[PDB]
Structures are given as C-alpha cells and as structure tokens.
Amino acid sequence: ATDQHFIAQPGVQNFLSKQWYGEISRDTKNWKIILCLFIIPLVGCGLVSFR
Amino acid sequence: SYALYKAFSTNEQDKDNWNGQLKLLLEWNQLDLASDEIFTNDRRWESADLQEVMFTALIKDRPKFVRLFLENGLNLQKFLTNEVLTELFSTHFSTLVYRNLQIAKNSYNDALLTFVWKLVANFRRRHPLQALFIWAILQNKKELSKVIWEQTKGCTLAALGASKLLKTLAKVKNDINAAGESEELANEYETRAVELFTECYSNDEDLAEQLLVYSCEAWGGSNCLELAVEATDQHFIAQPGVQNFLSKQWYGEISRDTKNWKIILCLFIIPLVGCGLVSFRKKLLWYYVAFFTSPFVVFSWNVVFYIAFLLLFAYVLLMDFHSVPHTPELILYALVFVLFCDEVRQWYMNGVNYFTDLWNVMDTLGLFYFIAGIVFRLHSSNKSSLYSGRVIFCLDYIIFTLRLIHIFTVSRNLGPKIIMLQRMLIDVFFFLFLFAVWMVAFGVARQGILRQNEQRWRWIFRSVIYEPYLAMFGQVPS
Amino acid sequence: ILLVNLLVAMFGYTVGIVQENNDQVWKFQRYFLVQEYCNRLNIPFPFVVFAYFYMVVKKCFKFRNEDNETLAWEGVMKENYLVKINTK
Amino acid sequence: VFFFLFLFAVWMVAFGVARQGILRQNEQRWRWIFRSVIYEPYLAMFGQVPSDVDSTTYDFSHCTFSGNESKPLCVELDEHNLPRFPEWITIPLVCIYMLSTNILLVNLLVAMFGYTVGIVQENNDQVWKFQRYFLVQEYCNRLNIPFPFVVFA
Amino acid sequence: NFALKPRMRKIFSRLIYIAQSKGAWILTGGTHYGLMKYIGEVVRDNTISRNSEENIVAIGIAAWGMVSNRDTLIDEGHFSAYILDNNHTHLLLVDNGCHGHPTVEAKLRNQLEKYISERTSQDSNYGGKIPIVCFAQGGGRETLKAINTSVKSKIPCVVVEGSGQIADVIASLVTSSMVKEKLVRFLPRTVSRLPEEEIESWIKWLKEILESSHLLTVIKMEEAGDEIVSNAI
Ligand SMILES: [Ca+2]
C-alpha cells in the first residue's frame, strides 16, 4: 500500500535493525565491526558482542 | 477496601489496633479514609513506631502515604540505616535496571556514573537522603522521587545530578521503553532545576551566586555549576542568572555598564588607567593592579601578542631567512618557547582530556612541526635540508594562522557564527562524495577515450583527478 | 551548476534550523573560556614564564554555619516554587 | 559581510604566506610581497586559480633573478637549474584553498543572506515608513523655490 | 500530637507574613510541640529569608512545671533534651508551686492582654489603643477557657476557623440543647471520659461565648483562597 508511516514507527525499525545486524548487538560501535572485518582472526576477542 | 475497613473497625476489640487499620488502608490505596479516620483527632500517635508502615509504603510505591506520614512527622536519617540500604539495593533493586546500568558503564563511563557504580557495588554488599533519592531515581519511580526531593537541602545539586544520571542511562539501546521514560524524567528534572534557580536568582542575586559554587560535602564530589556542564545541560547555563554571573566574573573589577572601546583604548594608553572614563566598581596602585589582573584585558593582551607573533613569523619566513639564524629568528624561537610553556602548563593542569579538544591537538601538532623545522634548519650547508626546513615552517604557519578562528570565538558578533560553522560538515561531506563520484566517472572515461596506455603515474592523476576537479571552478576541460 | 546550487540549498536549510540553538551553544561555550582564563593566576603573557618560575619556586619549597544558612535560605524559595506549581 | 571578510582574510593570509615561502626566497621589495600574498589569493575568490604552482607551465620569461625590473622573482632553483618546490605539496594546497574559499565560504554567505532576509521582512515596512517621517519633515521645514534658484531664496 | 493539614499550613504562613508586614507581636504557648513548633519554624523561615526589615517578635508563655531541664543563672544556658521551642525569640515562664499544674500561665497572659487593650499608642488607625486579635483552631479545655476569658473582657476580636475540634463546634452553631447535640456529634472521643458536672459548666462557658457574637467571626470553608486571613482580622 506504500504505508510508509507504519514502517517509520520505532517498532518496525527496531525489528529491521535487529534483523540487519543479526548476531551482533546494536549497542556496540560500528568502527569495531569494520575493524574486525579488516583483521579476520580478531573475531575471537572481547570487543564485539554476539548476544 | 471500605467494606473490609468497616468490618475491621466494628469488632470493638481491634479499635485500639490502629496499626492494623493503617496497614489495611496501606495495602489498598485509601488515602482520604486513613487521613480522615486515623490522623484527624490527634488523640493518638508516637512519631517513632511509624517505621514499619513507612518501609512498607516505600517498597510498595505509596507516594501519597509517605507524604501524609511526613506531614505528621518522621525524620528520614533516623529512619535510614545501612541495612535498609542493603535490603533496597540487594532485594528491591531490579536486575534489568542492573543490566542497563552495567551496559551503560561499559559504553558510557563518566565520573558521576563511576561514582554511582562504586556506591551500588558498596550497597549491594553522611548523606542518607541523597542515596535514597538515587535509589528512587534509577528505578524510574517518578513520584516518590519528588516526595524525597522536597525534603532535601541541596536541592538544585540533586536535580542536576539526577538529570545527568538519567540522560546517561537514556542512551542504552536495548529496552527502549525504560530509556524513553528515563529521558522524560531527565527533561523533567532539568526543567525543575532551571525553574528553581530562576527564583533563587530573581530574589537575591548574591545568595544565588553563593549557591552556585558549593560542593555540599562531596555530594558526588562536584559542584552545582559543574554538574550542568558534565551533563551538557546547556539550558541551565543559557539562562540570564548564570550568564550574568559569568559576565561579572569575566570583566572582573570593571563595571559592565561602560563601553568596551574605552577599555581597549585604556589598554593602548597605559597611564590612562588613572582617569574618569572607566568604572572600577565591582588606591591608584590598586587600580593599576586590578586592571592588569582582569581576565578580559589579559585575553585582549594575549591576542595582540599573538597577532604580533604572526607578523614576526611572516617577516622571518618571507624576508629574512638565511643559512645562519639572525636576530628575529632567535626572538621568534623565544616566543615559541613561551607559547610551548603555556601549552604544556595547560596540559599539566588539564591531564588526559586535554587531547579531547581538537584545537589542543593541532596546537601540539603545530609545536611539533616547529621543532621539526628547527632540527631541519640547523643542519647548515645542506641546501635540501635548509629548504625542507622552510617548507615545514610554511606548513606550520598555516596551522598557527588557522588557530585565530578559534581565538576569536569569544566575540558577541563573530562568536555564534563561528560556533554555527561546525554544524555544516555533513553537507560538505555529501557534496564531496557526489563530486568525487562524478569526478572519477568522467576522468577515467575521458582518459580512456582520448589516449592509449599512459605508463606514468603522475600524468594519470593530473588528467583523471585534477582537471575534472578544476572543472568545478568553471574551466571547461580543453 | 546542479551540485553546487544544491549545496547552497542544504546550507540555507541548516542555517534555518540551528539558529535558535546557536545562542545556547555559544553561551554554553562561554563557560569553558571563562574558567580556563580564571584558573590561572598569571601576569601578562610575554612574562608568564617568570610567573611560571614562581610556581617552580613553589615546587622548590613545597558542617559549616553559613553553608547551612544559605541552604536554609534556598528552602524558602523551594517551598515558594512548590506553591507556584500547585497554584496555577 | 564582516563574518565573510574575517574568514576570507584568515584563509587569504594563511595561503599567501605559505605559497610565497614555499616558492621563492627572500623577497626584499615590499610591493611584490603584497601583490603575491594578498592580491593573488584575493583574485582566487573570483575563480582565477593561482598559476604559479604547477612547475610544468612555469616559464622563466616572467622572472627577474634579482630585483631589478618589474616582474616577480623566480622560484629558487636547483644545482641542476630546476625548480625545487614539490608539486605534491603545492597542487593540493591550491586545491584545498580554492575549495575552501570559492565554494564553501561564498555559498555560506548566500545562506546567511537568505536567513537575514527571512527575518527582517516583517520589520522592513515598519522601519521604512518610520524613515518616511524624517524626509517629509526635512522637506516641509523649508519654504523655498525649486533648487537651482534656492540661493536667491 | 498535632495534625497540620495544608490549608492550615497556608493559613499560618500567610498569618506570619501578615505579622511581618504589619510589625506585630505574636503571643503563643511556646513549647516544642506541634503548632508552636511550626509557628517557630515559619518565624525562622521569615528571619532567614529577608534577614532584616523588622525581625518579628514571638513571645512564648510557658508554665515552668512541665520543662524537663531547668537551669538557674543570672551567664547563658543550654537547653537540650514539656520541651521549650527553639525559635521563639522571647520566653516568659510563670512561677508556681509544684510541677504538674497546667493552665497556670493563662491568668498573667490574659491580664497582659487586657493591659495592652487599655494601653494607648497613638500612631495607629484604631484611634490608638493597640488593637488585639485572638485566634483558636484546635481543641481542648484551654482553648474555650482562653476565648471566654478574652470575650469576658472587652475587645478580644475573636477569630475562629471552621477546622479543628472546638473550631467546628463554635463555627457550626452560628441554649444548652444545641450545644449538647453539636458537641457530641463533633467530639465524642474526648467527652467519653468527662462527667456532666463540668459539661454543664462548659455549657455556661459557651453561653458566655455566644453573648457577644459581634466579637466572634469565622473563616469558612468556601472562603479558602488567598488573602482570607486579612479578610478575617
Ligand atoms: Ca590550548
């Protein structure tokens, strides 16, 4: 219907963001995520939360 | 509740049990009935055994009942012991509030939140009402907190600290409902602190400025004027009371109701301090020293020193720069040593957050490029080194000249626009992103259509990047 | 033409928003410069190093009643403001 | 206008002194200091793109080798009689200056003009018809003839 | 024990503001209990707020038999723990024999009230004579005895409220029968212990009360806004 006000509300946005990040918690800063993307064996360190 | 109270009253033996009546009217929300039928006749009270019903009304969120109790009398410091605090933080403190507190401590640390993390680690294992107010405010109780806040002495300090705590806890991204209500209550208490201090200033200005500067026996170990800064409560400082305080601290001894051109004209002619053109309201040698101690004119002296420094650096760099250092280069080195001492003194009095501001970062960076210019400049008879030192001095003069924008942010006229200037970075970055995309997409296509297999790296970037860049200023690639 | 005159429009809109916040942020920034200039007890700048030596001179050698009085003053207008809330 | 001129003067001086110090060596004539530090970065606001920084389009027919005639000095030469200044430090310097003055700083002045026009328009008619009183009174204060004969009156 | 509902709080705060605005003395019991405590609190608040411009005068009048610690000097003493109130700036304690005797202070108090009522000070709009107003809001024997000792003298200017124990029975009725059936419907819980041989004397007390009803006025329940204390006095 292009009911864009139903998707602009924070519930559907919270759902879409939690589906977008996936396993990573939203309360980490994204530079840590791309820095862990650059250094592949840094996935095993306490800098990102996989909650 | 009224039926159970009528049956509980007419047994004719438990009428002397008014404690059971009060507890029954506490488990239900009968405020008016208990007020009209327990406290009205003033025949019976002790003001000391009301503590169990007090603890029950506190832990079960009965704000009108604790208001009615404190209206008839109980001292909170007599009521509170450390064991009550351990029961409140050990049992009645929620675990989801603890999880949001620890996530906020992991992501957003600050001195007040470090202090409340230390004290919650204390009481999960001398200011009673403030700690109970803290326990009320982290739970988002929103109605008991007002009741205890009306009983505090250091009221504005408590309101500003609670606003800081709730604004910091409102930034946690899971449990968005609790973050929303903490945001609401934070706005409520910053409004409350502003609207109380406007009355405290609008009656007696001197005692309001007495209020602003007291630490209240290490409330959170800070000051009332500092808690608004640490929370970035910029509406508390935008009000005319704190602005009047800051302006009267800024001018110092000079009255504010004189025109500032008289002040700078008296700065230019030094023995004109003894004349009736400036008012020193807020003997003559005291006038001399009180003039040369004011913050306004020591800033206005330091900016004239800085402009004279820039003119001397320009003369040295453009017109007198030889193999051996002449006299103005040595005078220049002395002035840079004085600026270096001032900046390292500001770093020693500031600490590690000195590197927070980018202006201090580029000041340190400029001093480092200056000493690099010296150590390239002193190795004489090597023309490559003696030219490279001057190149480093030019690229340093750029930094020292661009500091002048940050210097002149104090003005009433240029100031707000310079502060506005930093809100434009996102539009500039959007422009540069789109222009870089069109630049590359045109430059590679034109270089590939015109020529064949350029092997020199410099004439790739002069023809792909540089000429479509110049085509933004109206060049029309030839 | 298009990409520059779009930047003009975005600058104009951003100037349109931030102007009522502009004076607040400026007189918030006024506090930091007032405090960093009043934190120092110094002479004029070209002699500050001598005064700095004075501090080196230092480094070469080295409950209250009116508090509760002004807090008790504060509580009166606190009660007055509570009346001013519940009156309106 | 004063905010624009302040920022443009700061960028002007910070670019002109750096370019004059990187290119040449010990100019002793005061006129060719201010023609090269102040005047050419000023012309770079109208889209001129200061020419003396490219090191490929720089000829020695516009130099002097010593201050003897009109023209500016040369960039200081090598032992191989080549220019010494790096292209990789003077080309991006001119690019950053030209961006920061010819585009950002002018289109910010457009935005501030637009906002000021947005405010003062409801006060504009009031201030104009307040100013109308002064001209009406200064023209009605005189009992004179037409102007070329006023001296007779 | 004393219950202080917020209407009485507003009334007495406005009263002490009036007493500061007019430059008046306030005579009170002067103990550390309930109403006298709160009057002393508002005296201290109006002292700490303005710090000047006629610091107000509150004389407490106590019995000397109820005081816990009593120290005889000529040399100031310290009073810590009836109990005397901290914030009344003048205290007068009547002398008697043994300790357990209430209502001793009332005689010298009412005689002083009559003496100021006959004392003439010209700089006032009352034709001199220093006008005097008596209040009562609570309950007990002493309120009725004070109001009747005042109204038996000329010019008491008695003002009562419609809130309290005896304030209700004085406010509501405006002979013996109505006194009885209003006194039992508003106060049973004190008359449960009291014999009728002095309740007939209470009816005589109230009969002397309602003799001159022009010297008695009341603050009603609809009259509950601001400036209601000036409108009564
Ligand atoms: Ca600095």
Residue numbers in the entry:
A (entry chain B): 663 to 713
B (entry chain A): 409 to 533, 558 to 714, 722 to 917
C (entry chain A): 969 to 1030, 1045 to 1070
D (entry chain D): 867 to 1019
E (entry chain D): 154 to 227, 232 to 238, 251 to 343, 350 to 408
Quoted passage from the original study:
TRPM8 is also activated by ligands such as menthol, icilin, and phosphatidylinositol 4,5-bisphosphate (PIP2), and desensitized by Ca2+. Each MmTRPM8 subunit contains multiple domains, including the N-terminal four TRPM homology repeats (MHR1 to MHR4), S1–S6 six transmembrane helices in a domain swap configuration, TRP helix, and C-terminal coiled-coil.
We first determined MmTRPM8 structures in the detergent Lauryl Maltose Neopentyl Glycol (LMNG) in the absence of ligand at 3.0 Å resolution (MmTRPM8LMNG-ligand-free), and in the presence of Ca2+ at 2.9 Å resolution (MmTRPM8LMNG-Ca), Ca2+ + icilin at 3.0 Å resolution (MmTRPM8LMNG-Ca-icilin), and Ca2+ + icilin + PIP2 at 3.2 Å resolution (MmTRPM8LMNG-Ca-icilin-PIP2). In the map of MmTRPM8LMNG-Ca, strong density shows that a Ca2+ ion is harbored by the cytosolic-facing cavity in the VSLD. The Ca2+ is coordinated by side chains of residues Glu782, Gln785, Asn799, and Asp802 from S2 and S3. In addition, the side chain of Tyr793 from the S2-S3 linker is positioned in proximity. To confirm this Ca2+ binding site in MmTRPM8, we performed all-atom molecular dynamic (MD) simulations using the Ca2+-bound structure MmTRPM8LMNG-Ca as an initial model. Throughout 250 ns simulations, the Ca2+ binds stably at this site, with a Root Mean Square Deviation (RMSD) within 3 Å. The distances between Ca2+ and CG atoms of its coordinating residues Glu782, Asn799, and Asp802 remain 2–5 Å in most time of the simulations. Thus, the simulation results support the binding of one Ca2+ ion in this cytosolic-facing cavity in the VSLD of MmTRPM8. Therefore, it is likely that PmTRPM8Ca is also in the closed state, similar to the Ca2+-bound MmTRPM8LMNG-Ca structure.
